[PDB]
C-alpha cells in the first residue's frame, strides 16, 4: 500500500520499520524494500481489492439502511448510523449525483463488492497444514500430524 | 388600520413598535412592561378612562394574544430530534446490551408518547445510567452535564428561552474532544432538548392562559360598565363585545372588532 | 404510589393533577374487583 | 372537592370546573361513576 | 454625479426621491407611475420634447436598470430554507418511516437543480402527500393545503412580493394549536416558500426584460433623431450613444456618459 | 503621594505617565531612551542642580525598579506548557512510541536541570531528531524545520520579547499545514517555548541588574555630597539615604522614603 504513495520524507524509515519483524528472538527483514523489483510480488490487485472494498462499503450499506426501518429490526439500523457517522462524520454533502440511482446500478455495486471478497478468499484464511506434536533436540526436525 | 382608540399618534406608534418587535425584545410579558399600559391610558383623566381604558386594554390583550398566536415558532422541530435521540440511543442500547432496563424502556416509550410533564419526571432516574457510563463506579452527580462551563451555559440558555420563547437557540452540546462517550453525550443532548421543549411549552401555555384570562376579565368588567345604557348603539356594542372568545376565535374576532370599531368609536360617549 | 400532605396545602393545590395530564395507574384492588367470580381463580389473574 | 370514594361524580365536577373537563375530554374512560377515577394523590390513599 | 441640471430642481428632486425610495414604495415598476414619465417631460413645448424627451427617458431607463441591478436582494437566503425543508423533512418523512416515495425524492432533487415547471409539478405531488397526512386517507382537492384564512392572506402576500420583489415578507405559516401536524405545516411552509421563490425570480426577469426593451427602443429612436446633424459634437454624441449594452455593461456606460455629459449636452442643438 | 523633588507639574505628569504606561511601549530600557533624564533634571545650570537631581535620579531609578518588580508577568505559566510538551509527547514517543530512543540518555536530557536551564545543546539534539524526521539534513533553521514562512516573524516575536519582556505573546503553530504531525509540532513548540523562557528570564535579570547597579552607583554620589554638613536633619538624611538596598528590600524603602520625603525635602542645602 505505502509503496505507491510519494512525498513522505520518512518513507525509508517507515519501510524499514515495516520490513523489520521479530518473533521469538529471530529477526528477519522482509525483502520488499524500496521496490527493487527482484521479487516485490507487486500485490496490486490485493491492495486495489482492499480499497475497492473500503470505498464501496459505505454507500452500499447506506442505500440498504435507508429503506425498511418500519419493520422492527431494531439493531441494524441504529448500528449503521453510529458506525458510518462516527468515521464519515460529514456524510454526503455534495453527494456527487444528488440521489439519482438505478436499481440496476445498486445491483452492479453489490455484485462487484461481493465478487471482490470471494476472489480475495486467498488472503482471507490460512489453513493449518501441520500440527506439530513434538520437536526434536536442537530444532533440526519435528514430528507433526497432517491436517487439511 | 391600527384602530386602538382616541390615543395620540405617538402612543399608537409606540404600540406599533412594541407589537412589531415583540419577538425582538426579551422578557415578553405585559406585566413586565407596564409602559404599554400607561401608553394605553387615555388623555384627560379618568372621566374618559373609566370606559375607554377598559376598551383599550381589551384591544391590547386581544392583539397581544393575536401576535403571540401569529408568531409562535414550531417546537415540534426540537421534539423531532428528541424522538430521534430517545428512539435510536436509549431503547437500542438497553436492548442490544444490559437487558434489565426494559421496564425503563417501556417508560421511555411512554416518554415518546406526548405526556411530557410526567415524562420529564424521573429524568434523574434515566440520568443515573448516563452517570454510570460517564464515570465508572456510579455515584450521584449534579443533574446538568459533565463540563462545568457548559453546565452553566445550559442554564443561561434555558433562562433565555424561558424569558423569550419566541426567539430560542439550541446549544448543540457535542464535542470532538470526547473524554465523555458518544452515547452518553447523546444522553446529554436528550436531557437538554427535553428540558428545552418542556420549558418552552410550559411558558407558552402560561402566557397564553394569562392573556385569555385577562381578555375574559376585561370583557366582564366592560360589559358590566356598558350594561346601563339602552340606546341601540350601546346594546349593539354589548352584544358584540359579549361574544365568547377562545384562542381559535380571537383572530376572526379581531377582524370583527375592526369592522365594528367603525361604529363603536362613535357608540361610546 | 402513595403521597400524603396536609389539608391546608391540598385545598389550594387540589387541581394540579387535573391540570396536568398525569394518569394514575390502576390500584391492585380495583384491578382485582373487575374480574369475575370464576375468572379470579384462573392463572390469567394478575393478582392470585 | 372530590374527596371520598363516594361523592365524586365526574359529570358534576367537570361541569363546574373546566380543568377537569379537559382532563376528561382527553381521557374519557375516567368519566365513569363506578370505580375511582383519580382523586388528588394526597386524597386517593385507597389501602389506608 | 446626477445629470439633468437643465430640468427644474423640483423635478430632479422628484427623480432623486423616486430612485431613493424605489425599494420602499409599492408596485416597483416605472410603468405604474406615469407621473414620473410626465414629470420627465421637457420644457418649451413639443419642439424641445421631440429631441430631449428621448435622451431624458433614455437616462431614466438606464438609471432604473442600474438601481435594479444594485438593489436586487439575495434569493439564496430563502432558497436555503427551501433546501433545508426539502432535505430534512422529506428524508425523515420517507427514509425514517414507510418508504414509498423514493422515486419522488429522486424527483425533488432532480427538479431542485434548475426547473420551475417541475416545481409546479412538485407542488401537485406534495399537495397530494399533505392531503394524505393531514386527513389520513388519500384523496385529491385542488390548490388548498389548509387554513382558509391564511389561504386568503397568502394571495395578498404573493401579490405584495410580485409587485415589490425588492421588499418581501416571509409569512411564518405555522399554527400554535395543533389541529394538523408538524409535517403538514412543514409541507405548507415548503409550498409557500417555493411559490414565493419562483414569484420573485419571474417578476425579476419580467422587469429586467422590460427595462432592456425600453433601453433598446430609446437607442433606436434617439439615434434616428440625432442622425440629421453633421457637426463634430453631433457625430461624437452618436459614436458615444450608439454603442450596444448588456446587463453588465450598463454601469460602465453610465460612468462613460457621466464623464462625457458636458460634450453631449453641448451636442444637444 | 508620588514623591519627587521640585519639578514642574508637566514633568511630574510625564514621569507618572511613563511609569504608569511602562508596559505598552516597546524597548523598556530606561538607559536606552534618554528622554526621561532631561525631565529629571530640574533647571538653572549646575549651581542648584547637582544635589537635587542626584536625589531625583535616585527616586526615578528606584520607582522604575519598583514598578518593574510589581508588574512582572509570570513565566512559570509558559514553563507549565514546556512541561506539558516535554513530559507528555517526547517521552511517549521514546517509550510508548517504540523504535529506538534510549530511555536513559533522552529521559535524563529531559529531566536534568528542571530549574535554571539555559542549554542550547539539548535544543540541538532535539533539532537533530526533528530534522531526521524532516526532509533535509543540515541545521540551518533552529525552529520551524522544512519551512521559513514564519521564521522572520518568530525572529520578530523574540526581538519584541527582548524589547518588552513585560508584555509577551506566544505565537502559535499553524494547525492545517505541517510536515509531520503531532510530533514535529510538539517539538517545534518545545524549542520555541524553551527559547522564549530563557530569553525573557535573561532580559529580566539584565534589567534588574541594571537598575540595582544604577541605584548603588547613585547612593555613593549622593552620600559623598551630603557627608560634610553637621545639622541633625542633615545627618538623619545621610543615614536614611545610606541605608543599604536590595531589589527585594526596595519596596519598603520606597514607603520609608515617602515618609521621609516629608522631612528631607527641607533637609537639602
From Swiss-Prot, chain A:
It is found in: Virion; Host nucleus. Keywords: Capsid protein, Host nucleus, Virion. GO terms for cellular component: host cell nucleus; viral capsid. GO terms for molecular function: structural molecule activity. It comes from the Viruses. Signal peptide: none annotated. Its main location: virion. Interacts with TRX1 and major capisd protein/MCP. Belongs to the herpesviridae TRX2 protein family. Structural component of the T=16 icosahedral capsid. The capsid is composed of pentamers and hexamers of major capsid protein/MCP, which are linked together by heterotrimers called triplexes. These triplexes are formed by a single molecule of triplex protein 1/TRX1 and two copies of triplex protein 2/TRX2. Additionally, TRX1 is required for efficient transport of TRX2 to the nucleus, which is the site of capsid assembly. This is Triplex capsid protein 2. It comes from Human herpesvirus 6B (strain Z29) (HHV-6 variant B). The chain holds residues 149 to 296 of 296 of the full protein.
UniProtKB/Swiss-Prot annotation, chains B, E, F:
It comes from the Viruses. Phosphorylated at multiple sites. One of its GO terms (molecular function) is structural molecule activity. It is found in: Virion tegument. Keywords: Phosphoprotein, Virion, Virion tegument. Homotetramer. Interacts with the major capsid protein. 180 tegument protein pU11 tetramers bind to the virion capsid. Belongs to the herpesviridae large structural phosphoprotein family. This is Large structural phosphoprotein. It comes from Human herpesvirus 6B (strain Z29). The chain holds residues 7 to 275 of 858 of the full protein.
Curated annotation (Swiss-Prot), chain C:
It is found in: Virion; Host nucleus. Belongs to the herpesviridae major capsid protein family. Homomultimer. Makes the hexons and eleven out of twelve pentons. Interacts with triplex proteins 1/TRX1 and 2/TRX2; adjacent capsomers are linked together in groups of three by triplexes, heterotrimeric complexes composed of one molecule of TRX1 and two molecules of TRX2. Interacts with scaffold protein; this interaction allows efficient MCP transport to the host nucleus. Interacts with capsid vertex component 2/CVC2. Interacts with the small capsomere-interacting protein/SCP. Self-assembles to form an icosahedral capsid with a T=16 symmetry, about 200 nm in diameter, and consisting of 150 hexons and 12 pentons (total of 162 capsomers). Hexons form the edges and faces of the capsid and are each composed of six MCP molecules. In contrast, one penton is found at each of the 12 vertices. Eleven of the pentons are MCP pentamers, while the last vertex is occupied by the portal complex. This is Major capsid protein. It comes from Human herpesvirus 6B (strain Z29) (HHV-6 variant B). The gene is MCP. The chain holds residues 482 to 529 of 1345 of the full protein.
UniProtKB/Swiss-Prot annotation, chain D:
This is Major capsid protein. It comes from Human herpesvirus 6B (strain Z29) (HHV-6 variant B). Belongs to the herpesviridae major capsid protein family. Self-assembles to form an icosahedral capsid with a T=16 symmetry, about 200 nm in diameter, and consisting of 150 hexons and 12 pentons (total of 162 capsomers). Hexons form the edges and faces of the capsid and are each composed of six MCP molecules. In contrast, one penton is found at each of the 12 vertices. Eleven of the pentons are MCP pentamers, while the last vertex is occupied by the portal complex. It is found in: Virion; Host nucleus. Homomultimer. Makes the hexons and eleven out of twelve pentons. Interacts with triplex proteins 1/TRX1 and 2/TRX2; adjacent capsomers are linked together in groups of three by triplexes, heterotrimeric complexes composed of one molecule of TRX1 and two molecules of TRX2. Interacts with scaffold protein; this interaction allows efficient MCP transport to the host nucleus. Interacts with capsid vertex component 2/CVC2. Interacts with the small capsomere-interacting protein/SCP. The lineage of its organism: Viruses, Duplodnaviria, Heunggongvirae, Peploviricota, Herviviricetes.
Amino acid at each position: 500500500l505505502i509503496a505507491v504513495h510519494r512525498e513522505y520524507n520518512e518513507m525509508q524509515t517507515i519501510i524499514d520499520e515495516l520490513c523489520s519483524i521479530q518473533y521469538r528472538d529471530v529477526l528477519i527483514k522482509l525483502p520488499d524494500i524500496v521496490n527493487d523489483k527482484q521479487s516485490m510480488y507487486s500485490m496490486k490487485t490485493a491492495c486495489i481489492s482492499l480499497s475497492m472494498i473500503t470505498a464501496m462499503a459505505p454507500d452500499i450499506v447506506r442505500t440498504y439502511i435507508d429503506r425498511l426501518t418500519l419493520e422492527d429490526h431494531s439493531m441494524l439500523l441504529i448500528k449503521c448510523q453510529e458506525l458510518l457517522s462516527k468515521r464519515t462524520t460529514l456524510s454526503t454533502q455534495r453527494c456527487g449525483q444528488l440521489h439519482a440511482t438505478d436499481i440496476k446500478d445498486e445491483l452492479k455495486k453489490i455484485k462487484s463488492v461481493l465478487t471482490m471478497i470471494d476472489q480475495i478468499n486467498s488472503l482471507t484464511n490460512e489453513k493449518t497444514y501441520f500440527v506439530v506434536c513434538d520437536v526434536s533436540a536442537d530444532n533440526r526436525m519435528a514430528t507433526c500430524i497432517y491436517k487439511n | 388600520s391600527i384602530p386602538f382608540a382616541w390615543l395620540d399618534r405617538d402612543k399608537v406608534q409606540r404600540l406599533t413598535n412594541f407589537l412589531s418587535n415583540l419577538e425582538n425584545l426579551e422578557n415578553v410579558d405585559l406585566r413586565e412592561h407596564p409602559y404599554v399600559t400607561n401608553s394605553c391610558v387615555v388623555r384627560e383623566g379618568e372621566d374618559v378612562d373609566e370606559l375607554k381604558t377598559l376598551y383599550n386594554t381589551f384591544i391590547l390583550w386581544l392583539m397581544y394574544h393575536y401576535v403571540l398566536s401569529k408568531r409562535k415558532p414550531d417546537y415540534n422541530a426540537i421534539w423531532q430530534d428528541i424522538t430521534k435521540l430517545q428512539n435510536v440511543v436509549n431503547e437500542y442500547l438497553k436492548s442490544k446490551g444490559l437487558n434489565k432496563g426494559n421496564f425503563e424502556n417501556m417508560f421511555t416509550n411512554k416518554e415518546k408518547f406526548e405526556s411530557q410533564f410526567s415524562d420529564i419526571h424521573r429524568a434523574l432516574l434515566r440520568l443515573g445510567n448516563s452517570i454510570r457510563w460517564g464515570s465508572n463506579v456510579p455515584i450521584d452527580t449534579p443533574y446538568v452535564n459533565l463540563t462545568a462551563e457548559d453546565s452553566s451555559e445550559i442554564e443561561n440558555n434555558l433562562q433565555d428561552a424561558e424569558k423569550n420563547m419566541l426567539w430560542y437557540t439550541v446549544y448543540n452540546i457535542n464535542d470532538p474532544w470526547d473524554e465523555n462517550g458518544y452515547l452518553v453525550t447523546s444522553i446529554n443532548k436528550l436531557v437538554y432538548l427535553g428540558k428545552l421543549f418542556v420549558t418552552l411549552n410550559q411558558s407558552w401555555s402560561k402566557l397564553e392562559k394569562v392573556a385569555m384570562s385577562q381578555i375574559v376579565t376585561t370583557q366582564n368588567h366592560l360589559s358590566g360598565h356598558l350594561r346601563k345604557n339602552e340606546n341601540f348603539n350601546a346594546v349593539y356594542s354589548q352584544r358584540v363585545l359579549q361574544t365568547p372568545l377562545t384562542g381559535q376565535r380571537v383572530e376572526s374576532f379581531l377582524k370583527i372588532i375592526t369592522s365594528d370599531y367603525e361604529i363603536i368609536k362613535s357608540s361610546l360617549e | 404510589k402513595i403521597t400524603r400532605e396536609n389539608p391546608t396545602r391540598i385545598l389550594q393545590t387540589l387541581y394540579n393533577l387535573y391540570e396536568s395530564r398525569q394518569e394514575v395507574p390502576k390500584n391492585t384492588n380495583v384491578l382485582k374487583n373487575e374480574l369475575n367470580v370464576e375468572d379470579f381463580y384462573k392463572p390469567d389473574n394478575p393478582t392470585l | 372537592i372530590p374527596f371520598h370514594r363516594f361523592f365524586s361524580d365526574p359529570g358534576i365536577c367537570g361541569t363546574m370546573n373546566a380543568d377537569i373537563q379537559v382532563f376528561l375530554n382527553t381521557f374519557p374512560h375516567y368519566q365513569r361513576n363506578d370505580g375511582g377515577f383519580p382523586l388528588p394523590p394526597p386524597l386517593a390513599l385507597e389501602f389506608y
